[PDB]
Symmetry: C4
Amino acid sequence: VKLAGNSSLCPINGWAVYSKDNSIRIGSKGDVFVIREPFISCSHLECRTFFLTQGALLNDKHSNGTVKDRSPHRTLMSCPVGEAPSPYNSRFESVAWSASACHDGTSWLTIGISGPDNGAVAVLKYNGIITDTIKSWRNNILRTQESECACVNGSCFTVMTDGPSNGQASYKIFKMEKGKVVKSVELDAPNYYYEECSCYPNAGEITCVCRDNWHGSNRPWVSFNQNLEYQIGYICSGVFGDNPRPNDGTGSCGPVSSNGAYGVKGFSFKYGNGVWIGRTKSTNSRSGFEMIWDPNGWTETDSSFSVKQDIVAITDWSGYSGSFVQHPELTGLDCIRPCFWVELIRGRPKESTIWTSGSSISFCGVNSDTVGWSWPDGAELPFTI
Amino acid sequence: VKLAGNSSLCPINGWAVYSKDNSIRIGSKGDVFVIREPFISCSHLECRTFFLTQGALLNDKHSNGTVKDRSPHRTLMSCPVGEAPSPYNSRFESVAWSASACHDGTSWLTIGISGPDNGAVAVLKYNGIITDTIKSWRNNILRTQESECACVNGSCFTVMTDGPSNGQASYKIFKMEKGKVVKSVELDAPNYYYEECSCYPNAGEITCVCRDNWHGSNRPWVSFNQNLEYQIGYICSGVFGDNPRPNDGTGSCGPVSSNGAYGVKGFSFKYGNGVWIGRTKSTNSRSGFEMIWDPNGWTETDSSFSVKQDIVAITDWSGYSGSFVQHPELTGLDCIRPCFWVELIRGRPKESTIWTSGSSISFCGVNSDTVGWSWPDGAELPFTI
Amino acid sequence: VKLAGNSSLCPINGWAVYSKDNSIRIGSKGDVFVIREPFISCSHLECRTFFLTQGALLNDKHSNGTVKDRSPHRTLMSCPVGEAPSPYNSRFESVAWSASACHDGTSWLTIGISGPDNGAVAVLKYNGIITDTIKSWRNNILRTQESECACVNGSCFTVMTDGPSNGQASYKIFKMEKGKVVKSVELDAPNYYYEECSCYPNAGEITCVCRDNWHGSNRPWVSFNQNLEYQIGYICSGVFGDNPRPNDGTGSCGPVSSNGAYGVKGFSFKYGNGVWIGRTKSTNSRSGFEMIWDPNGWTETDSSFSVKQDIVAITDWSGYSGSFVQHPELTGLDCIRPCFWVELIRGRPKESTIWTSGSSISFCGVNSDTVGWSWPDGAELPFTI
Amino acid sequence: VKLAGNSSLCPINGWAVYSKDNSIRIGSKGDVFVIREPFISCSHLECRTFFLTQGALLNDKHSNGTVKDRSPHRTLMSCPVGEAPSPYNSRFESVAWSASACHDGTSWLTIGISGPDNGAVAVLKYNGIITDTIKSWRNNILRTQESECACVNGSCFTVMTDGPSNGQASYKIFKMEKGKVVKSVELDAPNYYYEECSCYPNAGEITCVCRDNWHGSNRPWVSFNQNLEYQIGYICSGVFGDNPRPNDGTGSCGPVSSNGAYGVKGFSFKYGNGVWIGRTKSTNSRSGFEMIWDPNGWTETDSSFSVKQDIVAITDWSGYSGSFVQHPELTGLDCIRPCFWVELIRGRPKESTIWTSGSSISFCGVNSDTVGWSWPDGAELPFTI
Ligand SMILES: CC(=O)N[C@H]1[C@H]([C@H](O)[C@H](O)CO)OC(C(=O)O)=C[C@@H]1NC(=N)N
Ligand SMILES: CC(=O)N[C@H]1[C@H]([C@H](O)[C@H](O)CO)OC(C(=O)O)=C[C@@H]1NC(=N)N
Ligand SMILES: CC(=O)N[C@H]1[C@H]([C@H](O)[C@H](O)CO)OC(C(=O)O)=C[C@@H]1NC(=N)N
Ligand SMILES: CC(=O)N[C@H]1[C@H]([C@H](O)[C@H](O)CO)OC(C(=O)O)=C[C@@H]1NC(=N)N
Ligand SMILES: [Ca+2]
Ligand SMILES: [Ca+2]
Ligand SMILES: [Ca+2]
Ligand SMILES: [Ca+2]
């Protein structure tokens, strides 16, 4: 039976710790993949961590140069949530340096992009079998979510981008059924930039919060039907969501140009005209993490907010973050539960090592008591090498 | 179908060896977690060892300082009984530095406490999904069993403590159904101290035997209905159960104040007005282990007993111990079978290493012939480091 | 329910990346088998990589001399596709230095050849139980596919060879049901040489493309019914398929004698009178890999072709390659899907190491957009040793 | 449904290779248990290798002194057949320095002996739950098969010994149903010695071939009903089965006293008044292995035989060997299939290492063509240490 995706998001008060894989700490001795761009996605039965390996293990010479984003050796793999990603516990999914994945209630859909920068191809698989292919249409690093796609009523949804990372690019939404593209639409979004979208279902409608790598310190959003009829904007809150960014100030419901170049993958959950914003604590680097409840932040431009929950201290490295959801058919609830993960990047460029890898933590939205703290990576660098 | 928990404890004569994981011996070379506070719990189908990892492996630098009790990296994980806890065979359960777990016949309930000492939060999960949260009410190290909760008739029961470890603290019993707290009661127990309770079901009633860290060399007990109507006392036997303790002498059915400060997690099984006591062999340190049958020891104050079965020699390290149970729906018996595990602590503070970890052994109550021996940890310290 | 094998091959335009195991890269640190002769085969439910271990792990002294083809320690094992072959994730199949395997829709049939060069015995197993034996009939290295057998309608088919590798040998086709030989036929093929056949089903008929180690630079083929009534020939295309070989030129629908001695395991898919040829890029060594569509190449002798898709660069090592198929009962398609794997050999004789091993990549035929690239082994030799 | 055990042994011509785990070779680098006394046993669905670990891994300091037979750290564990025994692939069964195991068609029965030499206790488990206990009755190393028990019609059968290893001891047969002893009988066997019995079912009757450690160079046998009504004797063949032994000569249907002290675990399969004998090739040491068909050897005293099949060369170490069986409900045959395993011991006392461990090979009886060879351990000693 297919995930309905017809229920609204659960009301929540805060975020309870869900997982921590301690991957880098464990990899000091154990056989743990060098990875980055991890994400969590759930079915009607289980929750899995997906990740892009570098086809190499921590503390081994083949970890050399793994700051590098794209290679033929990068693979999408998955393991049960909270476990350190190892060749002994991980399922192979796809050859990929950019990925997405989601379960429709029947099978896993995985999307894996590999190939050359000027002609990359997204390979779609449904239950591990190739069901479709999407080829680069702008010949400039075809690239997708690095988090879970969204499913409603037997149809699953993703966003891909193609073109410059430093200017106007091309943005497409894709609708797939049983791993096959049945509809796509190019966004008519001049002056906007979409990348690395974190997309979730809410009462039959999909909302994505993305990365403006071009000229935005706030995050752009797209929301759409099951017919791909869409609306676009930027989160108006002056509690700026990207990294880097300016100090909190007067928002825009377009791109905030100070410190708008570059970015980091992130997410936010829309609650009416309010927003839950996950962001780094640093304005400059991928350091720290916090959840902020801003009850008029989706549409209003002020920097005032109601509630900050600490997740990672400023003195500790963070990285990418993304939404994931737990559906009624898994939880038994009457609503869709919002959750999030944070990637905890260690190594290059910030630290003197030959390698780059990430750990993960995750949290679920809860309508009971919670607490702020710091759950950092905890590895001691550098390694034996 | 839910575990009934309506049957009485099996009649037994002694204890037969059930498991030994050899974790520390194996971890000298293999990828074995640094752990402490292990415990065993069973379902209608399987038995699992739960444990608090230090988010690190034995013989690796990240094992440095693991004598330390609480950190953000500590996680509750589980593996099949008797297997060495490894990232390759362990299921992730929760982020936790204090834990409990039990199966109601349908799903695993896990309880994991993490967060700061002044505001820790117990995260409850049912089938791996968060179902409730309990926040520290005295802001002083919220802490739970470090052994299995008890289930009867689709309801599961645990004890938590909050407050000083050196004086009067606050003690609550919790009743949960499908991982959600449905009732709780604070114990009216002036001059008593409860901690690290080992709780088991017996004919619809739960009995816990706990640790008085304040001023008790004997163990306190609580027993209660499914309505949380309770009775309290201390084991009267002059065969004192805690560590440290005085020499065996004249018991109290209150706290025995000589050597009553500090303690160790332990258990006992009440059999009428008699008791099976598991305890260290040393009066001073966590060394050795023995089972003692004292047939009037629950209510009488003398130091005479009938039967001693050796489990670990005085010349070998022991540590925590706890009860676990095997229900009729798993065993096919007409009674609830009592079992116990012992944690075998190696390293700090007693030995010159940078790390602390534990192995485990376990035993089940049997109505046939058995034998005393020593089944110690067997690792040779120190390690390569 | 048995795999029907009554459907035709899917129409395709190109090849989409399916897997990459990164085995040698991972084995630099992790516990990965020294292997060669890997192959992929699927059931109605899963896809597995089969391989011949050397009964040893990479970067260990027992990897010494593993360029050697046959030993008592060689074993056939399998693991899920795309995972590095490890003692922790691999199923034991058979004692073997030559092998085949395939699933009939009910159970795995495995064929494992071990024993002395002058009297080797093929052990057939069905669901892991020995169901038959085939003994060497020419007393000179009995040897089979090193890729999947072919199944149609509850019957499975393989080819074995016995005799000289440098002249006329003896070639038999075998038909088995439930792992038991029910019919065999010796090919009447004077001046032909068959070895290491890659065999696939197409509408109830089996086609094998093989290795002429004697005097053929093009590949021989056999096709047959379920009654073992056969036809024989060589691929006529002047796009020569073997390694070594001459430059592309004027083909033969017999063996092309320039550079015809020695060879490499390979495959081709017949599409009418056209062919998809997989071959090394080098004419001399096992280097590079490419797919070539030659639309009249099965029967015509010219060297012109329509479509080249790059798979591995000339500057990188390749090795064996083979066909595998995915049936309608697994994919839900109305046709049999063609796929292929490539073995990426590292070490001896081409590189200064004490050992020889292979990685694998794989690709599936798709009727949508695809891209050429290089997905090489990526290990950096030599190893610690 | 229970294994019937009512069918006769399959007619066979020879032995086909079934498995080889390469454990010691793999353990040079990988995390492989130090073990000895392995054995294979099957259910209606799977085949598993059982083994007595030393609670330690190969090439680690805790392997020191593992020539030693009994310790508290020895555990019975199991893994799928042909896989190297690792903490990552092995199921914990029991705490044991002597063991037996067998499946009745419903669940695994395991028997594990631990405790002191003067009071050891056999712990019986059915589906991993303790169902009975058997205590030493002569207070002198209670000891059992080190191979599979035998099951017929929902009842399982084993042999245990207690007393001197250098003279008359006490020998009991045990009948169990659902892991509980329902009948036992002490053998009235003056001048006989039984130990380490290899027992198999044949048409409702159990036959065991054992080790006379006292004064027998030939093997003793017991055969019995489901009522424990028994007959006893020694294999009459002058093809002597034990190690050490004299040269082949004139047999006895009592103990052959030359070279009769000490022994090695072994087996034989009775076929009418004929026997299939598995034995070392050396008369002195545990070296080499061969299968011999002696068609009148059960009852006749001559040294002539019909058929020798080589299994391990004299120049290579062997060790224990034992029978195992595959029942009709697993294989689909109309008969019980005979199989055997050989333990390949490396290290002490014969080789200069600090440790002792064993690999395994196995073979099944087949009515088709087979071949003799040598499949030795293949590890190169000594190790890094
Ligand atoms: C496909 C690709 O290379 N994506 C990049 C991503 C990208 O460079 C920016 O979003 C600009 O478009 O940046 C980052 C990053 O850490 O900023 C990592 C991602 N790496 C990987 N997914 N491998
Ligand atoms: C939550 C916490 O830190 N609990 C402690 C426990 C505690 O200090 C005493 O019971 C006093 O309250 O003592 C010990 C101990 O070994 O004595 C270990 C436990 N460690 C862990 N559970 N991590
Ligand atoms: C059974 C056997 O030894 N087969 C050989 C194969 C063979 O030598 C040639 O085809 C000539 O007949 O060559 C090769 C090879 O790399 O060329 C490896 C195979 N190795 C293994 N399958 N182990
Ligand atoms: C229980 C016990 O210690 N059994 C011994 C066995 C025994 O010494 C002889 O049969 C004499 O009775 O000998 C041997 C042996 O290698 O000869 C190993 C067995 N070791 C183990 N099963 N651990
Ligand atoms: Ca930006
Ligand atoms: Ca105390
Ligand atoms: Ca050739
Ligand atoms: Ca003897």
